[PDB]
Amino acid sequence: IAKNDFSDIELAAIPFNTLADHYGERLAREQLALEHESYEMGEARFRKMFPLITTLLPKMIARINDWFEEVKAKRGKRPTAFQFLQEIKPEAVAYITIKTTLACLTSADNTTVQAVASAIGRAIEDEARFGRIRDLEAKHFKKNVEEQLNKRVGHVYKKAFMQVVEADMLSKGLLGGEAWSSWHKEDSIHVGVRCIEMLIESTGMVSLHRQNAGVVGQDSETIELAPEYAEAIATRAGALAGISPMFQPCVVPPKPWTGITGGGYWANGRRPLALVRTHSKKALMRYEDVYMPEVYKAINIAQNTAWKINKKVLAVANVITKWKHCPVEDIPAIEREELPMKPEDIDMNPEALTAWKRAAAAVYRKDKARKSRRISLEFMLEQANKFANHKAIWFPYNMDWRGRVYAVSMFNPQGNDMTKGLLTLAKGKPIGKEGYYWLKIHGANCAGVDKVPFPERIKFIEENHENIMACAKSPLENTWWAEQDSPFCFLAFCFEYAGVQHHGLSYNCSLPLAFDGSCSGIQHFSAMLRDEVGGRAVNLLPSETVQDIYGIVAKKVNEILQADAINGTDNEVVTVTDENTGEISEKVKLGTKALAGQWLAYGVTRSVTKRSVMTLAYGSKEFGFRQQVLEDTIQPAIDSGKGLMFTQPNQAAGYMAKLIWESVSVTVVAAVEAMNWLKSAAKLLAAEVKDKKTGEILRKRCAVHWVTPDGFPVWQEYKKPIQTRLNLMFLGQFRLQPTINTNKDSEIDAHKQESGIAPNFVHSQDGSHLRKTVVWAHEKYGIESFALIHDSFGTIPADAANLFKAVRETMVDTYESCDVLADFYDQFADQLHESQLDKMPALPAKGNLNLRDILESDFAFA
DNA sequence: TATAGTGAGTCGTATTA
DNA sequence: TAATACGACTCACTA
Incomplete structure (x- = not known):
C-alpha cells in the first residue's frame, strides 16, 4: 500500500516516471508542476511576471515571517494557530491563503468567516501533510529523465489524442490514499482565521464585516473584498494572472479510478481526491470494498473525454468583458451602484427610514453579488487563456x-x-447531414427556441442565416448573438455553423x-x-408539441383563481370574532375572493409557478413553502413599486402556496404519492424504538440506505452537529468568537432525514x-x-x-x-x-x- | 454529506522568556 | 515571576 509500502523518495518519483513513460517528459513535468500550484507558486512563474499576486504574495510572506518572530519573542501560551502553522513553508501559507480566499469570494452568498477560515485550514493541512513528498517530487521532475530521446519526445504530434493509462499499468505507489482531513475543526478554523488576519494586515485585500448586529438568526461575520481590488480585478487585464483556482484541468489524461481514493490527479505531493464526497471519513469508508464495475467504468469514460479552449469565443470574451457596457447583459457591470440618496428628511420616522434601510441593504446585496460574479468570470478567463494553445485538456471527475x-x-x-x-x-469528426441537422437544433436551443417542435427550430436558424453569418464574421460589430438565451454558447454555434457554410458537410x-x-x-x-398521465406532462410520450408541466400547473392555478374570483370566501371583518374586545388586529382575513383577485391582478404565469414549484420540496426549501413565495414573488414586487394588490402580503403568499401545491398534486398524482411513500419510510427508519416506561432501545435511529440500478450504493445519514465557539482575539481589536460545527456528531436528524429522502432518491x-x-x-x-x-x-x-x-x-x-x-x-x-x-x-x-x-x-x- | 449567531465581562489554567 | 492566549460561561443584542 502506497502508505508505508514505499519510501518518500519512491513516491516522489513514481508518478513522474510513469507519466513520462507515456506522454513524455515535457507534459509529464508540466502536469505535476500544474498540480503543485495548488500549494506553492513556482519561483519560475512569479519572478517572470516583473498582476496583483506580484504585490500580494511578498507582502503576505513577509507578514507571516514577522508574526513568527513576535510569537517566539514573548512568554506564555503560544497561539493555537502558530502550533500548526509554525512547520509549514511560509511561501506556501501565503499562496494558499491568497488563492483560497479569492475562491471563496466567488460565492454570492456564503462568505462567513467560518466558510473561509474553514477552506483555508483544510488546504493548509493538505500542505503540512504531503509537503515533504511535494518538495522531493518537484526536485525529481526538475531533472530530465534518463536517455532514449524517442521516449522523452513524448507528445510527437500524433493526430490522435493521448490515451488513458491501463489500470494494471499503475504501480501500487500510485494507488492514492487518505482524502479526509484529520485536524479538528477548532484547529482548522484557528489556522484559517489567523491566516485571514495576516492577509488583512499585510495587504488590504479583504476586510471583516459584521452583518445584522443583534439578530439571533442572522448575526454574522463576513469577508468582503476591498473596493480597491474589486475595481482592479474588474478593470485590469489579467489582474488574477498567476492566481489559478485550487483545482485545475489536466494537460494529460487523468489517472483512472480503481478505488475509493487517489483517482484523477497524478501528483503524490498533494492531497488525493475521494471517489465520493461524503460528510465523514466513516461514510466514505463504506465504499472501500463495495465492487461496482459499472460505476468506475462510467466515471473513467467521462474522465477520459478530451477538451480544448474555443479560441474564437475566448477572443471575444477577452474583449467585451472589459467594456463599460457589455452587450451580454449577464456580465457583471464594471461601475458600482451608488447608495439611494437619503431623503434629506431622513430624520422622519415613517416607514421611510425603514424602507430606505431596505433599499440600501438591497444595493449592498447586489454589489456583493456583482463583485463575486466578477471574480468568478475572471478566474474562468484566466484559466481559458492559460490553456488556450494546448492541443487538449482533461477534467478529472467525482461523485x-x-x-x-x-x-x-x-x-x-x-x-x-x-x-x-x-x-x-x-x-x-466530419459533420455530415445528420450532424448538421442537430447542430442547428443546438443553435436553436441556445437561442430561446426549445419549447417548439424540431422543424420550427430548424426553420428558426435558416430564417436567420444571414444574421448567424454576420455574427460569425464580425461578433464585435454584429451583436445579435449577445442577445440570445445562452449568448456565448450561441456565439460558439455561430462560428461552427459558418464553418459548415465554407467547407461543406465534410x-x-x-x-x-x-x-x-x-x-x-x-x-x-x-x-x-x-x-x-404524469409521464406525458414531462415528455415521456411521443406528442406533436412540447409539453410544459410548468405551464399546465399554471393554467390549473388560474382556473382556480377564476373560480374563487366569482365565488369563494369574503373578507371576514377584523379578527375580533372569537372572543371579546381589544384585539381588533388581524383586521382582515381576506377571503379567497379577494386573494384570487389580487393574484389575477398580478398575473400568475408559467414563470411565477415554475421557480415556485422548484424551490419547494424537491430542490431546496427551508420550512415554509409559502414563506418562500412571499420572498421570491410578492416581496420583490412590492419592493419594485408594484405589488399594491397585496394588501396583506402574508395571506396572499399563504393562499398561493396551497393553490400551487394543490395544482401539482392533481397534475402529477402518481409522483406525489411516491414521495409520501418514500417520506414515510424515512420517518420510521429515523425513529427510535420506544415503549411505555422501559424505554430501553431495540433499534437506535437508522440511516436510509438503498442501491442504484447500476450498482451505486448510497446512505442518507443527516446528523445534528455538536457545536462550540472559539474565542479569537482578532487584529488586537476585538474577540472574534465564531460558532462552528464540530467533526463530532450527536444524533441523526429526524426532520432533515425525511425531508430529503425524495429528492436525494431521484437524484x-x-x-x-x-x-x-x-x-x-x-x-x-x-x-x-x-x-x-x-x-x-x-x-x-x-x-x-x-x-x-x-x-x-x-x-x-x-x-x-x-x-x-x-x-x-x-x-x-x-x-x-x-x-x-x-x-x-x-x-x-x-x-x-x-x-x-x-x-x-x-x-x-x- | 457542505456547513457553522456575535462580542464583552470575567475567571481559571497550563505555558514560557 | 508574571505575562499570554483562550476555553468555558453568561448576558444582552444596535433588533
Whole structure:
C-alpha cells in the first residue's frame, strides 16, 4: 500500500516516471508542476511576471515571517494557530491563503468567516501533510529523465489524442490514499482565521464585516473584498494572472479510478481526491470494498473525454468583458451602484427610514453579488487563456454522496454560459447531414427556441442565416448573438455553423451539442411508476408539441383563481370574532375572493409557478413553502413599486402556496404519492424504538440506505452537529468568537432525514441513468467524447444522433428490468422497523405507461 | 454529506522568556 | 515571576 509500502523518495518519483513513460517528459513535468500550484507558486512563474499576486504574495510572506518572530519573542501560551502553522513553508501559507480566499469570494452568498477560515485550514493541512513528498517530487521532475530521446519526445504530434493509462499499468505507489482531513475543526478554523488576519494586515485585500448586529438568526461575520481590488480585478487585464483556482484541468489524461481514493490527479505531493464526497471519513469508508464495475467504468469514460479552449469565443470574451457596457447583459457591470440618496428628511420616522434601510441593504446585496460574479468570470478567463494553445485538456471527475457526477476543476464543462462557450470537444469528426441537422437544433436551443417542435427550430436558424453569418464574421460589430438565451454558447454555434457554410458537410466539427431531460425527477417518478398521465406532462410520450408541466400547473392555478374570483370566501371583518374586545388586529382575513383577485391582478404565469414549484420540496426549501413565495414573488414586487394588490402580503403568499401545491398534486398524482411513500419510510427508519416506561432501545435511529440500478450504493445519514465557539482575539481589536460545527456528531436528524429522502432518491436515480448512458453510448455506439451536466447529455455532431437514441434506450432498459421502489422496500424491511411495521406500507400502484414509447418521444431527452 | 449567531465581562489554567 | 492566549460561561443584542 502506497502508505508505508514505499519510501518518500519512491513516491516522489513514481508518478513522474510513469507519466513520462507515456506522454513524455515535457507534459509529464508540466502536469505535476500544474498540480503543485495548488500549494506553492513556482519561483519560475512569479519572478517572470516583473498582476496583483506580484504585490500580494511578498507582502503576505513577509507578514507571516514577522508574526513568527513576535510569537517566539514573548512568554506564555503560544497561539493555537502558530502550533500548526509554525512547520509549514511560509511561501506556501501565503499562496494558499491568497488563492483560497479569492475562491471563496466567488460565492454570492456564503462568505462567513467560518466558510473561509474553514477552506483555508483544510488546504493548509493538505500542505503540512504531503509537503515533504511535494518538495522531493518537484526536485525529481526538475531533472530530465534518463536517455532514449524517442521516449522523452513524448507528445510527437500524433493526430490522435493521448490515451488513458491501463489500470494494471499503475504501480501500487500510485494507488492514492487518505482524502479526509484529520485536524479538528477548532484547529482548522484557528489556522484559517489567523491566516485571514495576516492577509488583512499585510495587504488590504479583504476586510471583516459584521452583518445584522443583534439578530439571533442572522448575526454574522463576513469577508468582503476591498473596493480597491474589486475595481482592479474588474478593470485590469489579467489582474488574477498567476492566481489559478485550487483545482485545475489536466494537460494529460487523468489517472483512472480503481478505488475509493487517489483517482484523477497524478501528483503524490498533494492531497488525493475521494471517489465520493461524503460528510465523514466513516461514510466514505463504506465504499472501500463495495465492487461496482459499472460505476468506475462510467466515471473513467467521462474522465477520459478530451477538451480544448474555443479560441474564437475566448477572443471575444477577452474583449467585451472589459467594456463599460457589455452587450451580454449577464456580465457583471464594471461601475458600482451608488447608495439611494437619503431623503434629506431622513430624520422622519415613517416607514421611510425603514424602507430606505431596505433599499440600501438591497444595493449592498447586489454589489456583493456583482463583485463575486466578477471574480468568478475572471478566474474562468484566466484559466481559458492559460490553456488556450494546448492541443487538449482533461477534467478529472467525482461523485457527490448520492452518486451525481461532477467535474473537479473550478473551470469546467458543467459551468455557466460563458464557461461552456469557452470549451469545445477536442477529437471531432466530419459533420455530415445528420450532424448538421442537430447542430442547428443546438443553435436553436441556445437561442430561446426549445419549447417548439424540431422543424420550427430548424426553420428558426435558416430564417436567420444571414444574421448567424454576420455574427460569425464580425461578433464585435454584429451583436445579435449577445442577445440570445445562452449568448456565448450561441456565439460558439455561430462560428461552427459558418464553418459548415465554407467547407461543406465534410467539415470537421467538435462543438458539444446538448440534450436535456424535460423536468428531471418527475420523469423518473413517472417512469418507475409507469404513470402515463404524469409521464406525458414531462415528455415521456411521443406528442406533436412540447409539453410544459410548468405551464399546465399554471393554467390549473388560474382556473382556480377564476373560480374563487366569482365565488369563494369574503373578507371576514377584523379578527375580533372569537372572543371579546381589544384585539381588533388581524383586521382582515381576506377571503379567497379577494386573494384570487389580487393574484389575477398580478398575473400568475408559467414563470411565477415554475421557480415556485422548484424551490419547494424537491430542490431546496427551508420550512415554509409559502414563506418562500412571499420572498421570491410578492416581496420583490412590492419592493419594485408594484405589488399594491397585496394588501396583506402574508395571506396572499399563504393562499398561493396551497393553490400551487394543490395544482401539482392533481397534475402529477402518481409522483406525489411516491414521495409520501418514500417520506414515510424515512420517518420510521429515523425513529427510535420506544415503549411505555422501559424505554430501553431495540433499534437506535437508522440511516436510509438503498442501491442504484447500476450498482451505486448510497446512505442518507443527516446528523445534528455538536457545536462550540472559539474565542479569537482578532487584529488586537476585538474577540472574534465564531460558532462552528464540530467533526463530532450527536444524533441523526429526524426532520432533515425525511425531508430529503425524495429528492436525494431521484437524484441518485438520474445519477445512475447518466452513468449507464455513458457506458452504453460508449460500448454500443462509438461515442468517445461526453458533455455531462446532471440531466443534459452532449457530444460532437456526428455522434449526436446515436446519443439521442442512447439516453432513451438506457432509460427504457433500467425501468423495465428494475422496480427501484420494490428494490428499496427490500432494503429497509429486514434492517428497518422492529415490531410494529404498519401504517407506512402500500407500494404505490404501477400505471399504464408503456416505457417503450420513450424510444419514440422527441422531446423526452433524458 | 457542505456547513457553522456575535462580542464583552470575567475567571481559571497550563505555558514560557 | 508574571505575562499570554483562550476555553468555558453568561448576558444582552444596535433588533
